[PDB]
Design a protein around this ligand. Sequence first.
Ligand code: HEM
Length: 208
Amino acid sequence: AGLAVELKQSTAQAHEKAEHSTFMSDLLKGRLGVAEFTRLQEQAWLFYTALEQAVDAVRASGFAESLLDPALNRAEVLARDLDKLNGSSEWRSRITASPAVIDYVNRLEEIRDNVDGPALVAHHYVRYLGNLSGGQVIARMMQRHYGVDPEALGFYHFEGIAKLKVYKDEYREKLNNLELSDEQREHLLKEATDAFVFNHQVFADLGK
Ligand code: HEM
């Protein structure tokens, strides 16, 4: 039972922990506010920027090309959302990576500079399949609990992909068809675990 399934199984426990961080739990249940959502999206712009440099490098190397669809790119969409949420472009010169984000960005830059395809695919799975798959729930809760304008929720929209359910199915088939060795597969799986570890610390730092 192939890679897509093994990824899901392998990270299922971490995914469930992710739903329950104090920050995310509090956010989704209405206990926070648009300001806290904006702080999250600012950190996310930082790590999606880094992620997408690593994706560009890996795609250019010819690994997992069809998986690494540039239509998934989130950083510029995020910046447009952040221009709406903050009311201006002034965030870019005020924002600072949290310590958790420094660690995560450093890993992403390591993957980039090593052109580590298997490692990159792990982080691509955790970031993009998560959004493609469940981001709509988060966006609905930001609208319903805090009145965020959907124009500021572009991050969750995948402009340019129509049929998201089919896209998800195809994304999994690409994972299943990747040519990996036993060593590349274990590295990818470990990395997907580490990805959830990084995300957990980002949320913890947001919650402080
Ligand atoms: C820590 C931030 C999160 C990350 C990195 C993340 C990651 C992911 C990933 C990788 C998937 C794909 C699982 C798979 O099918 O292989 C996924 C799916 C999903 N996530 Fe999240 N998730 C996060 C938080 C959340 C939250 C807070 C919710 C709200 C309940 C949520 C709801 C869902 C839903 C409904 C799916 C679709 C079913 C699935 O693909 O398994 N996620 N998420």
